[PDB]
Each structure stands twice: as C-alpha cells, then as structure tokens.
Design an enzyme around this catalytic site. Structure first.
Site, PDB file in Angstrom:
ATOM      1  N   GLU A   1      -4.851 -42.338  12.290  1.00 31.02           N
ATOM      2  CA  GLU A   1      -5.549 -43.128  11.279  1.00 31.02           C
ATOM      3  C   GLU A   1      -5.241 -44.616  11.328  1.00 31.02           C
ATOM      4  OE1 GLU A   1      -8.003 -42.127   9.571  1.00 31.02           O
ATOM      5  OE2 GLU A   1      -7.817 -39.946   9.537  1.00 31.02           O
TER       6      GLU A   1
ATOM      7  N   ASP B   1     -14.267 -47.442   8.186  1.00 27.89           N
ATOM      8  CA  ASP B   1     -13.815 -46.362   9.059  1.00 27.89           C
ATOM      9  C   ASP B   1     -14.834 -46.072  10.164  1.00 27.89           C
ATOM     10  OD1 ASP B   1     -15.798 -44.684   7.990  1.00 27.89           O
ATOM     11  OD2 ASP B   1     -14.437 -43.393   6.898  1.00 27.89           O
TER      12      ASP B   1
END
Ligand code: JZ9
Length: 163
Positions: free
Chosen positions: A11, A20
C-alpha cells in the site's frame, strides 16, 4: 514478515491525500477516504477519521493509527462473514495474511467474486487456487501486487515479500 509489514509494502505510505489505483481519494497506508470525485468530501472524511482539521495532510503516527484500525476491522469483518470465516479458519497463519491483504484491498464486496477460489483454498488445492485467483479483474488491474498475494496463497511462505 507479518500482516502489517506485508500491507505496508503493498500500500505504501503517503501523508497527503492521493488517488489510489482506482482513482479514489486515499491517505496514509491505503486508507480509502471516499469514492466521491469531490476533494472537499475526501477532506471532510479525513477530518472525521482523525478528529481534527487536517487540510489534507496527516502525520506518520496518524497514518499508522488508521492502519491499525483498518487491519483490525478487515480481520474482524472476515470473522463476521459466513462465506469467509470457515475458509479463513482453515488456513495457516501465512495464508491468512494473504486473505487479509485481499480483503483490505478489495473489501468484502470484492472478495464476494472469489467464491470459486475460496473453495479451492479451503480444499488446499494450492496450485489450482492460484490459477483461479489470477483469472480476475483484480489480477489484471494490479498484477504485480496480485502476483505477490497469489504466491503467498500458493506457497504459505513469504517468498514474494522477504526480499
Ligand atoms: C482467500 C481466502 C479468504 C479470502 N481470500 C478473503 C477472506 C477470508 C478467506
């Protein structure tokens, strides 16, 4: 290696609101803020999450706090899910981390589409499960991360991360 280190690799860590892989406002260690295209809505979600007016920026400690909450909620969600709990409980500790990683990225709506894969994992048909897991939007959109997670499911080792 453990679930925190694994997800930290997958991440990243960013202290300012960013988008994202799906274009959604996110902060910290993969903390999704909103699917809204409105940055102001994302900033409001951030402020609510942290409990202060952040104006789109947080500290490392704050990012790690959200991460702790998000990992815990991901695991607890698995245990509360009738389709997921028996599969999760059938797995060894390393493969459980792969399951948490998947749920963290995709949510339970996302893993809902992995039923067939789930059955193969519960059966411990590891190579077959790995082949099935890759036949997915998940794999095609994030192939290098999915390859790591799938290797973890296939082998029950940290080979895809330890380096
Ligand atoms: C592969 C197995 C499992 C997942 N992926 C997500 C939820 C727990 C069980």
């Amino acid at each position: 290696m453990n679930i925190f280190e694994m997800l930290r690799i997958d991440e990243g860590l960013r202290l300012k609101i960013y988008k994202d892989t799906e274009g959604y406002y996110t902060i910290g260690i993969g903390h999704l803020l909103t699917k809204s295209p409105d940055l102001n809505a994302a900033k409001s979600e951030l402020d609510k999450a942290i409990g202060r007016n952040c104006n789109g920026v947080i500290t490392k400690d704050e990012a790690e706090k959200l991460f702790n909450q998000d990992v815990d909620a991901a695991v607890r969600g698995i245990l509360r899910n009738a389709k997921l709990k028996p599969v999760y409980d059938s797995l060894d500790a390393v493969r459980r981390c792969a399951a948490i990683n998947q749920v963290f990225q995709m949510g339970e709506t996302g893993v809902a589409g992995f039923t067939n894969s789930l059955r193969m994992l519960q059966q411990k048909r590891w190579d077959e499960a790995a082949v099935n897991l890759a036949k997915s939007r998940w794999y095609n959109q994030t192939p290098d991360r999915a390859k790591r997670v799938i290797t973890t499911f296939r082998t029950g080792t940290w080979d895809a991360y330890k380096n």
